[PDB]
Design a binder for these strands. Structure first.
Ligand SMILES: [Mg+2]
Ligand SMILES: [Mg+2]
Ligand SMILES: [Mg+2]
Ligand SMILES: [Mg+2]
Ligand SMILES: [Mg+2]
Ligand SMILES: [Mg+2]
Ligand SMILES: [Mg+2]
Ligand SMILES: [Mg+2]
Ligand SMILES: [Mg+2]
Ligand SMILES: [Mg+2]
Ligand SMILES: [Mg+2]
Ligand SMILES: [Mg+2]
Ligand SMILES: [Mg+2]
Ligand SMILES: [Mg+2]
Ligand SMILES: [Mg+2]
Ligand SMILES: [Mg+2]
Ligand SMILES: [Mg+2]
Ligand SMILES: [Mg+2]
Ligand SMILES: [Mg+2]
Ligand SMILES: [Mg+2]
Ligand SMILES: [Mg+2]
Ligand SMILES: [Mg+2]
Ligand SMILES: [Mg+2]
Ligand SMILES: [Mg+2]
Ligand SMILES: [Mg+2]
Ligand SMILES: [Mg+2]
Ligand SMILES: [Mg+2]
Ligand SMILES: [Mg+2]
Ligand SMILES: [Mg+2]
Ligand SMILES: [Mg+2]
Ligand SMILES: [Mg+2]
Ligand SMILES: [Mg+2]
Ligand SMILES: [Mg+2]
Ligand SMILES: [Mg+2]
Ligand SMILES: [Mg+2]
Ligand SMILES: [Mg+2]
Ligand SMILES: [Mg+2]
Ligand SMILES: [Mg+2]
Ligand SMILES: [Mg+2]
Ligand SMILES: [Mg+2]
Ligand SMILES: [Mg+2]
Ligand SMILES: [Mg+2]
Ligand SMILES: [Mg+2]
Ligand SMILES: [Mg+2]
Ligand SMILES: [Mg+2]
Ligand SMILES: [Mg+2]
Ligand SMILES: [Mg+2]
Ligand SMILES: [Mg+2]
Ligand SMILES: [Mg+2]
Ligand SMILES: [Mg+2]
Ligand SMILES: [Mg+2]
Ligand SMILES: [Mg+2]
Ligand SMILES: [Mg+2]
Ligand SMILES: [Mg+2]
Ligand SMILES: [Mg+2]
Ligand SMILES: [Mg+2]
Ligand SMILES: [Mg+2]
Ligand SMILES: [Mg+2]
Ligand SMILES: [Mg+2]
Ligand SMILES: [Mg+2]
Ligand SMILES: [Mg+2]
Ligand SMILES: [Mg+2]
Ligand SMILES: [Mg+2]
Ligand SMILES: [Mg+2]
Ligand SMILES: [Mg+2]
Ligand SMILES: [Mg+2]
Ligand SMILES: [Mg+2]
Ligand SMILES: [Mg+2]
Ligand SMILES: [Mg+2]
Ligand SMILES: [Mg+2]
Ligand SMILES: [Mg+2]
Ligand SMILES: [Mg+2]
Ligand SMILES: [Mg+2]
Ligand SMILES: [Mg+2]
Ligand SMILES: [Mg+2]
Ligand SMILES: [Mg+2]
Ligand SMILES: [Mg+2]
Ligand SMILES: [Mg+2]
Ligand SMILES: [Mg+2]
Ligand SMILES: [Mg+2]
Ligand SMILES: [Mg+2]
Ligand SMILES: [Mg+2]
Ligand SMILES: [Mg+2]
Ligand SMILES: [Mg+2]
Ligand SMILES: [Mg+2]
Ligand SMILES: [Mg+2]
Ligand SMILES: [Mg+2]
Ligand SMILES: [Mg+2]
Ligand SMILES: [Mg+2]
Ligand SMILES: [Mg+2]
Ligand SMILES: [Mg+2]
Ligand SMILES: [Mg+2]
Ligand SMILES: [Mg+2]
Ligand SMILES: [Mg+2]
Ligand SMILES: [Mg+2]
Ligand SMILES: [Mg+2]
Ligand SMILES: [Mg+2]
Ligand SMILES: [Mg+2]
Ligand SMILES: [Mg+2]
Ligand SMILES: [Mg+2]
Ligand SMILES: [Mg+2]
Ligand SMILES: [Mg+2]
Ligand SMILES: [Mg+2]
Ligand SMILES: [Mg+2]
Ligand SMILES: [Mg+2]
Ligand SMILES: [Mg+2]
Ligand SMILES: [Mg+2]
Ligand SMILES: [Mg+2]
Ligand SMILES: [Mg+2]
Ligand SMILES: [Mg+2]
Ligand SMILES: [Mg+2]
Ligand SMILES: [Mg+2]
Ligand SMILES: [Mg+2]
Ligand SMILES: [Mg+2]
Ligand SMILES: [Mg+2]
Ligand SMILES: [Mg+2]
Ligand SMILES: [Mg+2]
Ligand SMILES: [Mg+2]
Ligand SMILES: [Mg+2]
Ligand SMILES: [Mg+2]
Ligand SMILES: [Mg+2]
Ligand SMILES: [Mg+2]
Ligand SMILES: [Mg+2]
Ligand SMILES: [Mg+2]
Ligand SMILES: [Mg+2]
Ligand SMILES: [Mg+2]
Ligand SMILES: [Mg+2]
Ligand SMILES: [Mg+2]
Ligand SMILES: [Mg+2]
Ligand SMILES: [Mg+2]
Ligand SMILES: [Mg+2]
Ligand SMILES: [Mg+2]
Ligand SMILES: [Mg+2]
Ligand SMILES: [Mg+2]
Ligand SMILES: [Mg+2]
Ligand SMILES: [Mg+2]
Ligand SMILES: [Mg+2]
Ligand SMILES: [Mg+2]
Ligand SMILES: [Mg+2]
Ligand SMILES: [Mg+2]
Ligand SMILES: [Mg+2]
Ligand SMILES: [Mg+2]
Ligand SMILES: [Mg+2]
Ligand SMILES: [Mg+2]
Ligand SMILES: [Mg+2]
Ligand SMILES: [Mg+2]
Ligand SMILES: [Mg+2]
Ligand SMILES: [Mg+2]
Ligand SMILES: [Mg+2]
Ligand SMILES: [Mg+2]
Ligand SMILES: [Mg+2]
Ligand SMILES: [Mg+2]
Lengths: 120, 122, 55, 114, 211
RNA sequence: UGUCGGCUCAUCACAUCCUGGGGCUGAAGCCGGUCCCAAGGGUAUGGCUGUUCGCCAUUUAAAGUGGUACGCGAGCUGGGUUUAGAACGUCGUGAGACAGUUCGGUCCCUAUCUGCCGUGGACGUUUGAGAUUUGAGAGGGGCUGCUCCUAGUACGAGAGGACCGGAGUGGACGAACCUCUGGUGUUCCGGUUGUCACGCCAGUGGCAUUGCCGGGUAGCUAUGUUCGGAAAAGAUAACCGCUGAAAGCAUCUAAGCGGGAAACUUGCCUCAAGAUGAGAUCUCACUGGGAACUUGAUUCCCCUGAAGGGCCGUCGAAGACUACGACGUUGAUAGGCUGGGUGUGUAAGCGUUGUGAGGCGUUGAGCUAACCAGUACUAAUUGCCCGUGAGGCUUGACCA
RNA sequence: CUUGUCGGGUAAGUUCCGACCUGCACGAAUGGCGUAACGAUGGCGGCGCUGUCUCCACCCGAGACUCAGUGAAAUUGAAA
RNA sequence: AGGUGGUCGGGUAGAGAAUACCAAGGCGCUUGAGAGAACUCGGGUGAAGGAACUAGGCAAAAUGGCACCGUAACUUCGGG
RNA sequence: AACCCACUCCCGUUGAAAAGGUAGGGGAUGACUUGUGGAUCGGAGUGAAAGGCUAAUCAAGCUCGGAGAUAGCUGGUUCUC
RNA sequence: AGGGGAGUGAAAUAGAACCUGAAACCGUAUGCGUACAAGCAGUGGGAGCCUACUUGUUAGGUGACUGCGUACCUUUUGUAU
């Protein structure tokens, strides 16, 4: 049974999952638009959106907290300087998921993940 | 809860130090004995000149248990060890003194004597 | 464990009476007139009347 | 759960002065042997505390007669007539379950003076 | 039985008596029930009353159901239930509240039990396992034997096997009503009630009762 | 056609071990003996031994007897037995032997058909659809101890000690549940060892079984909580009768009328119209033309496709896939966001004290999963497909 | 014969240890009786420890399950 | 997932060529994606008991280092 | 520790493997382990002896001949009236 | 890769895996039958429907319903076994 439980195992150890979603979050903040699997995209929004909300106020303790969760100086620089200021007045929902078919290799469902107000 | 081959100490001065449960009385296939339950024990260790001897089969009542006893408001009382009181043929205590605290559910008709002898009732 | 008798032509064709395939839900994007999967982004890159990825 | 919280809120009127794990408290319990109504004192150190509104509870431990005894009290039960904090202790944890393996001088709780 | 209400299981709590006794209690919200159809000997065969409770959107109510809810000016609710009454008189439009129950009043509660998906014989039928050591080979929680040899030489119907500890309907009999809250529309019942929080429950006077 | 014993799971008989109903007794009472009726439910744990068995110890209301390949190895085991090694006693000149001992010794198979446990797809139920139902039938369940009052009464010289009737509290078994008591809780918070890295200090992160540990939310769960077995009716078994002749009497029987048990039929719970004998009730939808006939339950063409169902999406205490349940902007379905709650336990930085480890303040701080309430910020499109166009005939009664 | 009889150990010991001699059918280099140390050797008994068990519960990974690709096997007189 | 002679073999801990985390150097093991049933495999924790399991403590749990104190019967005088 | 071995459990048994793997286990300066080259063989060799080993074959190897050995024993034996 | 036309040839369904091209086995199309029915699947009776034409004492295809009916070989005193 699984009653009232949240989170997907995704056939990985819990240490593998932590590293993988930490990699996706860094990629999303830099490239502004990535393509991944649909189940993975629905678990990424529970990891990267708390980081954008955390970056809405700039302080030494907050930039240290962000670095402990994304071990990337560039990702912490992209937040606190571009994101969090762009989403200052936006109350949640900073990213969007759109289904985009299946891969040829394994017929895996795919989706796009992009930030809401890309400057393009 | 006490079952067969559980080891528990004696809360009396009957001369026994350790007894081992060999039967839980009062029902077919009965499994556990709690505070106030009659069991059948064997003496495993004794004083040189006590009034019980090693290897003697007899009856005891559970007085103090590690599992505990629950009350009507949901509260529970627990002790650090399991203890018993050895009884004679007519279900009366063999010793004359009782060591350690007891509980208020021992104040039945046939165990009121050992409640009055206890230094404390909880 | 294995069969004591070999299956007949009819017997194994009744088992396959459930092997048929279902169709997908397709839609036509009225702005362009292009056929796409329902609730998906079109191969061009449109969804609900907007450009999203532009190849 | 919004209307369960209101059922429980009407039964919470006792004062319950603040206490913490590691404190030495005296609990006055109600005993009704026969028809008489007396109060019995249970004094010991608070080792655990459960903060669940009307389902709150705490555990106190004492050495009675060479035997250690632990009682878990339901905070809002009418059996708990009153409570008072005799002393305050200085500990780092929420649950002091390690005290069960210490007996004499080893199980002393340092006092929080300030 | 023969008359009752339809409620929702809100959850569990406790109440303390002045003597220091804790009563386990299940809270049931009973939104007032509206009579939709009355069935008599001549019109329908048997004799019963039809009831609805709750609310539904206009877009989720079909035209067949909407016209049934318009013959009795009742307005649509979630679900429709029936109570087989012995000899009572009702009209299409009457209200049925927590007021037909009092403190005491042993009652029966029906609900849909929590659903385990696909259970083995140990969990479903309380079988006992084989050895976990002493040479056992990949047969720790397996059922064992399921029949006998040439004689009958088949498995008897009703043999206890594995699968679907169900989300079935079960009744719990002779539960005591502790408190009836008329203004909040609540029934407080001592004990446990089948189902999860937010499920549908049916409360009726106890069939056996007596003592 | 795999041969003992053990484990797991059983099913039937009655020549009945307990509980239930009776006759006789060399039946005062409490206990017994024997026979008749009765198969609903129950019917130990261990020490020894490979043991079935048996003997012991301690329980229980009782620890029933048998059939099912001495039930059950394509369900497990491998102690015994019956391969190959080695030894003892005995027998043989010897190779060797023993239905005599002793130590050691590989247990294969992905389930086609019948069967069984669950869960679906198709069609039918005579126009179609949404919902609520009756109950032919079938399953589940059915155990029992002790104490108190009657009453120290009946009975008995005394010792002792009831029937009938009522109240309470247990054991075993079963179901549901998570308020409480606990367990778990690699998705929460801390402590700490070794090493590498983030330029460095500080602070953090990877790896070491989750590195090792201390706690712990929701969910699940028992050892925790609540409930259950009934009462009652009917027809009976053995048994006890009323009236009553054949047979002036007697006689439960030949006519007639009764009492009578955990057995049977209900009553309690669950499934149940594929019950093809396919049942019932409420409501809803559809009210167009033409041609060919092999001239009526016929075929074809054009128009028109309703009530409703499905596909799809957001999900769920529902779930192997299904199915079931809620919602899809006229929206709180999921995620986020905002508050709270819960857990952990006084973060970082800074300021002081100290040569330093460390302490003290800011500070019950900081962080916080699944929980509660609110909120359209993000995602649930502006769609497609099925399903039609008033529902045959015969007979009877109402009706015009 | 035989679970011989007696004693010890257990609440209870067909195994164990100490004796008795009635050696079915011991016995002196196919050596007799002892023996410190040694043994992945046989039997028995204790302390600690524990999911071995009462009686299982929860959690984590790999299968099982579904989707896409590739694609066996023993067996088989015919099967409504 | 087997076997195959010889040579070199750094840093931090460490007695060490053990072990752990790294260097130079090399690799992620030629089907993937989901979901989170029974059951199987490999593990973690477990209330109250503590061998009651079983042919048998099988398996698991437990002990484990360095310095110092201290250590029995018996002995072939080394030992134990 | 390396190296040589193979006592226990489990898995695997259509195996990753026609004898393995993960956990534990024994010896580990010697009656040790190992590379290269060489010698002994079919009623023969070699054997700290198990009837063991002599190319996945051993109470007498493989191969080719006598040879279509012999089979009072199983199996089979084909169109019509 | 493989095809659709066009061309050569007497003939490409003689196209190079090339004469002829059977059976097992696998498909597409049409006609009739089949979702309340129990078993060596046939045989005797038999309605209905479809096709053809000689327009029903005919031919061909299906077979609702119903009586009867436990493969073949071998070996045996004896086999559905
Ligand atoms: Mg959720
Ligand atoms: Mg790790
Ligand atoms: Mg078959
Ligand atoms: Mg066969
Ligand atoms: Mg079939
Ligand atoms: Mg198929
Ligand atoms: Mg359930
Ligand atoms: Mg479920
Ligand atoms: Mg078992
Ligand atoms: Mg085995
Ligand atoms: Mg095996
Ligand atoms: Mg196993
Ligand atoms: Mg079998
Ligand atoms: Mg049969
Ligand atoms: Mg069964
Ligand atoms: Mg067989
Ligand atoms: Mg069993
Ligand atoms: Mg029978
Ligand atoms: Mg009888
Ligand atoms: Mg007899
Ligand atoms: Mg009997
Ligand atoms: Mg009887
Ligand atoms: Mg009698
Ligand atoms: Mg019976
Ligand atoms: Mg019986
Ligand atoms: Mg029966
Ligand atoms: Mg019967
Ligand atoms: Mg009955
Ligand atoms: Mg036993
Ligand atoms: Mg026994
Ligand atoms: Mg034995
Ligand atoms: Mg039997
Ligand atoms: Mg028989
Ligand atoms: Mg027999
Ligand atoms: Mg047998
Ligand atoms: Mg038997
Ligand atoms: Mg087996
Ligand atoms: Mg067997
Ligand atoms: Mg097997
Ligand atoms: Mg078989
Ligand atoms: Mg098997
Ligand atoms: Mg053996
Ligand atoms: Mg063995
Ligand atoms: Mg031999
Ligand atoms: Mg001789
Ligand atoms: Mg061996
Ligand atoms: Mg042997
Ligand atoms: Mg068959
Ligand atoms: Mg019926
Ligand atoms: Mg039927
Ligand atoms: Mg019945
Ligand atoms: Mg039944
Ligand atoms: Mg009864
Ligand atoms: Mg019983
Ligand atoms: Mg129970
Ligand atoms: Mg349960
Ligand atoms: Mg709980
Ligand atoms: Mg809780
Ligand atoms: Mg560095
Ligand atoms: Mg540093
Ligand atoms: Mg570190
Ligand atoms: Mg690293
Ligand atoms: Mg750890
Ligand atoms: Mg450790
Ligand atoms: Mg801990
Ligand atoms: Mg933890
Ligand atoms: Mg915990
Ligand atoms: Mg919990
Ligand atoms: Mg008479
Ligand atoms: Mg008379
Ligand atoms: Mg007369
Ligand atoms: Mg008569
Ligand atoms: Mg129907
Ligand atoms: Mg109908
Ligand atoms: Mg419509
Ligand atoms: Mg629907
Ligand atoms: Mg789902
Ligand atoms: Mg749906
Ligand atoms: Mg709103
Ligand atoms: Mg919400
Ligand atoms: Mg929050
Ligand atoms: Mg808090
Ligand atoms: Mg501080
Ligand atoms: Mg600070
Ligand atoms: Mg920290
Ligand atoms: Mg302070
Ligand atoms: Mg806090
Ligand atoms: Mg003998
Ligand atoms: Mg003897
Ligand atoms: Mg003896
Ligand atoms: Mg033994
Ligand atoms: Mg001599
Ligand atoms: Mg000799
Ligand atoms: Mg000797
Ligand atoms: Mg050796
Ligand atoms: Mg020895
Ligand atoms: Mg023993
Ligand atoms: Mg596949
Ligand atoms: Mg090194
Ligand atoms: Mg070391
Ligand atoms: Mg190494
Ligand atoms: Mg490198
Ligand atoms: Mg996967
Ligand atoms: Mg798993
Ligand atoms: Mg496991
Ligand atoms: Mg463990
Ligand atoms: Mg834990
Ligand atoms: Mg434990
Ligand atoms: Mg713990
Ligand atoms: Mg413990
Ligand atoms: Mg212990
Ligand atoms: Mg034993
Ligand atoms: Mg046993
Ligand atoms: Mg071991
Ligand atoms: Mg270990
Ligand atoms: Mg020694
Ligand atoms: Mg080598
Ligand atoms: Mg192991
Ligand atoms: Mg090894
Ligand atoms: Mg080694
Ligand atoms: Mg050695
Ligand atoms: Mg050499
Ligand atoms: Mg040679
Ligand atoms: Mg030769
Ligand atoms: Mg030999
Ligand atoms: Mg060769
Ligand atoms: Mg060889
Ligand atoms: Mg010749
Ligand atoms: Mg020949
Ligand atoms: Mg033959
Ligand atoms: Mg031409
Ligand atoms: Mg041709
Ligand atoms: Mg040709
Ligand atoms: Mg060809
Ligand atoms: Mg030619
Ligand atoms: Mg050809
Ligand atoms: Mg052909
Ligand atoms: Mg076909
Ligand atoms: Mg066809
Ligand atoms: Mg029928
Ligand atoms: Mg039919
Ligand atoms: Mg059939
Ligand atoms: Mg014919
Ligand atoms: Mg014809
Ligand atoms: Mg025919
Ligand atoms: Mg026929
Ligand atoms: Mg026939
Ligand atoms: Mg024969
Ligand atoms: Mg014969
Ligand atoms: Mg045959
Ligand atoms: Mg015949
Ligand atoms: Mg045959």
């Amino acid at each position: 049974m699984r009653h009232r439980k949240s989170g997907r195992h995704l056939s990985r150890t819990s240490a593998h999952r932590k590293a993988m979603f930490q990699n996706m979050a860094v990629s999303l903040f830099e490239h502004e638009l990535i393509k991944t699997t649909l189940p993975k995209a629905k678990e990424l929004r529970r990891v990267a959106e708390p980081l954008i909300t955390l970056a809405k106020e700039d302080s030494v303790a907050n930039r240290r907290l962000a670095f402990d969760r994304t071990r990337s100086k560039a990702a912490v620089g992209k937040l606190f300087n571009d994101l969090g200021k762009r989403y200052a007045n936006r109350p949640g929902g900073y990213l969007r998921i759109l289904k985009c078919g299946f891969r040829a290799g394994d017929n895996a469902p795919m989706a796009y993940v992009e930030l809401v107000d890309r400057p393009v | 809860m006490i079952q067969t081959q559980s080891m528990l100490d004696v809360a009396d001065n009957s001369g026994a130090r350790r007894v081992m449960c060999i039967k839980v009385l009062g029902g077919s296939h009965r499994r556990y004995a709690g505070i106030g339950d009659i069991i059948k024990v064997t003496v495993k260790e004794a004083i040189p000149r006590g009034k019980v001897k090693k290897g003697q089969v007899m009856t005891a009542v559970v007085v103090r248990t590690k599992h505990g006893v629950r009350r009507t408001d949901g509260s529970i009382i627990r002790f650090d060890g399991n203890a018993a009181v050895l009884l004679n043929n007519k279900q009366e205590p063999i010793g004359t003194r009782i060591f350690g605290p007891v509980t208020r559910e021992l104040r039945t008709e046939k165990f009121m004597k050992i409640v009055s002898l206890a230094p404390e009732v909880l | 464990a294995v069969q004591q008798n070999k299956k007949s032509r009819s017997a194994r064709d009744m088992r396959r009476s459930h092997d048929a395939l279902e169709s997908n839900a397709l839609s036509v994007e009225k702005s362009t007139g292009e056929v796409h999967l329902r609730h998906h982004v079109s191969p061009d890159g449109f969804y609900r009347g907007r450009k999203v990825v532009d190849k | 759960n919004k209307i369960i919280q209101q059922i429980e809120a009407e039964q919470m009127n006792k004062e319950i002065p603040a206490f913490a794990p590691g404190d030495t408290v005296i609990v006055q319990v109600k005993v009704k042997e026969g028809d008489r109504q007396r109060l019995q004192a249970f004094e010991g150190v608070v080792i655990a505390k459960r903060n669940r509104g009307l389902n709150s509870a705490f555990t106190v431990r004492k050495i009675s007669n060479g035997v250690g005894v632990e009682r878990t009290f339901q905070t809002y039960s009418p059996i708990v007539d009153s409570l008072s904090v005799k002393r305050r202790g200085d500990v780092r944890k929420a649950k002091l379950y390690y005290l069960r393996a210490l007996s004499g001088k080893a199980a002393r709780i340092k006092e929080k003076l300030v | 039985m023969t008359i009752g209400v339809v409620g929702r299981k809100c959850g569990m709590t406790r109440i303390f008596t002045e003597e220091g006794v804790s009563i386990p209690v299940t809270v049931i919200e009973v939104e007032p029930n509206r009579v939709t159809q009355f069935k008599t000997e001549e019109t329908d065969g048997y004799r019963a009353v039809q009831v609805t409770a709750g609310e539904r959107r206009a877009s989720r109510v079909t035209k067949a159901q909407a016209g049934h809810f318009a013959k009795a000016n009742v307005a649509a609710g979630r679900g429709v239930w029936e109570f087989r009454l012995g000899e009572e008189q009702y009209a299409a439009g009457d209200q049925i509240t927590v007021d037909l129950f009092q403190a005491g009043q042993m009652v029966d509660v029906t609900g849909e039990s929590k659903g385990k998906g696909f259970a083995g014989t140990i969990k479903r039928w309380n079988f006992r396992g084989q050895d976990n050591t002493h040479g056992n080979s990949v047969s720790h929680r397996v059922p064992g034997s399921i029949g006998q040899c040439q004689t009958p030489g088949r498995v008897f119907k009703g043999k206890k096997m594995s699968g679907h500890l169900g989300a079935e309907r079960v009744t719990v009999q002779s539960l005591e009503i502790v408190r009836v809250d008329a203004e909040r529309n609540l029934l407080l019942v001592k004990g446990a009630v089948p189902g999860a929080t937010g499920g549908d429950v049916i409360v009726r006077p106890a069939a056996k009762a007596r003592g």
